[PDB]
């Protein structure tokens, strides 16, 4: 390469590195390509050959302030030098973790009061499950334990959290989903069975199907419902009109807890600080990760509504100290990154930019490719957008999955210097740019996307 | 305090910080104390009041090179500046992650070939479960899925990983353990039912009970057995003579995979680089975390034996790209810390020191308190030690748990400037000092421990 130190990186990578979300065989045998990333600034990343790309996916919906922000790197460095680690067990902490909990609560919807820290969105949803079950056992409701998720939801990659996930990739050959997880309708207007339904009618159909599930299972057995405000990995799918209002009316009716999974939406991505506030969701638990630190250091959170919190306190008074902890819960360099990141989001006015430049980006994408014969839909909200491809628009005929149309378009786009993502379980090109994206950078992404679409379909 | 910036830290902590392994109510209401940690060097830590302590528990068995090692802090800082984050999905990586995978394999038992990175020991055991089930589905053995753990084992704090854990604190009110986890005998000679058994006879009894379980359940249904080489959180309990030899003979007989959970033992703690090598364990999967980075940044690993790996590759050739990933898998600042840490372990000759000064420490502790009327046992191996208290030694009468004798001794010790841990589910004072501990520092820990024992029991 140009920037590598070792001359052995390909051999070591292929011989010893078991990558997430990679084909083990093609990688090991040298059949699939690899990319060793070296640097970045703003919206630009580069590899160890020095090849540059505009990263219109911000890593994985996570490098929200953009790359190379030395304020956050310096915050990490300072904490790493002073005290990289001590535990947060039995009332131990650092100034950074205590300060961050306060900052998160200030930004969260009113009525939120406590934050429990982890390392990944998956562990935060794991914590949620334990809390939901603990809460119901404390209340003397041992049967109230089932958790309703949704098809195409993404909630993590563990055993229980992969069960919550509603995408087959995270289930097949892993013996998931496991009880007591259930899945209701995908909140996905474009793929509705009855095309005569308006958005609000489809939202009511989803609410009605949730109600039927709750009643069939026994409401006394349903503990919680989990949803992303807008689907991330399940296709960059904003909720249809009326959805959150109607779903919440059903949940309230049967005393079902609401978990808003804000791993993608937390801290500004939609042009509002929280996605729950953006869509009028009043949750009991909020999952956070990714944009909490702009991925500068790993960190997750569970934000707990005060009414749930008070029950947890009653539980501790009967049962004692909580049987839940991660060694690296509240890890000092990670919470330090979170403090710096949240200040930087405000200083750079990125919540405003995400909404305003996000709207511009989405409008421009619609103009550029929405008219194409093989573009079924351009959709999104804030700084999230997707282009979904179809074989026939009038009759909504999808391409056979074997054709890999989504991947073809993402590959063409990448070759032209722009990173977007071919989403799973469809032909969908997704975008989640850093929240600092300028209009001029948006224009480049849109132009190259039109070139990539034209190329694949001509 | 002396070192705090904000004058609001107590209020914020109690009002907003949901700590791991803490009583929610006492913490919230201001009834239990808190400690805000500020700094450290070597074996000494201090809080934001400037109060110093010798940390004879190295955080949580994890600050292995000791505190304030600027080599590792600088490595983190450099990576954070250059590229704090990019994903490792679809064959993406960094020089740091690729280099670390190679370094881990070099140090691991021969026959190990791949490493999958995570953030916590709990997520590494989660990955293990998914791999075990995937492996058996690929082999056409859909019924071969049960996982045998052990009472008093510690394997993490999730739903599935808390199920693997064999300590009640991680089960009660959380509806654990869940199928298909089973628990066999605690590998705990001091508490054997039949006191006439020698260590080797007790080891054979444990092997026989494992065999009976396997046969009762149906060997065709048992996928794996998981164990720490020496129990950490379950009481600092070395395996009895013959244990690992006899257990492995049973597992081999029924084609059961062996997972060595080395979250505590990995990277030198026993005076050997791996605990598996220390006790003659030949595992199929190795869990690592804690000492992998000396906790300077969060990081976990699953080390995969090449024979298991080859089956996984056959699976990818049939099923495609792996449906498993954490956003922060192979997080660049975390793998950078791991590279620096492993070099520092060698440079400071800490594997040697852990064995040699660990043996000295343990001998000195035995001389100082082993003769006390209320000390049932002083035990340990390498740089791990424990003192277990009893009400009557001859008749092995334990104190009532309500008396909190273990906590009393740990509290007295702390008041004298030394941090050890009152272990769960017993009266046991545990030690896991940094691997750089000197003989002179050992002497201080031993002396203060004798003072603390004498004080509680007089």
TrEMBL record, chains A, B:
Any Pfam family matching the protein: Aminotran_3
Superkingdom of the organism of origin: Bacteria
Residues bearing PTM N6-(pyridoxal phosphate)lysine (covalent): 290
Required co-factors: pyridoxal 5'-phosphate
GO CC list: cytosol
Protein name: Putative aminotransferase
Residue sites binding pyridoxal 5'-phosphate per the record: 121-122, 327
Source organism per UniProt: Mesorhizobium japonicum (strain LMG 29417 / CECT 9101 / MAFF 303099)
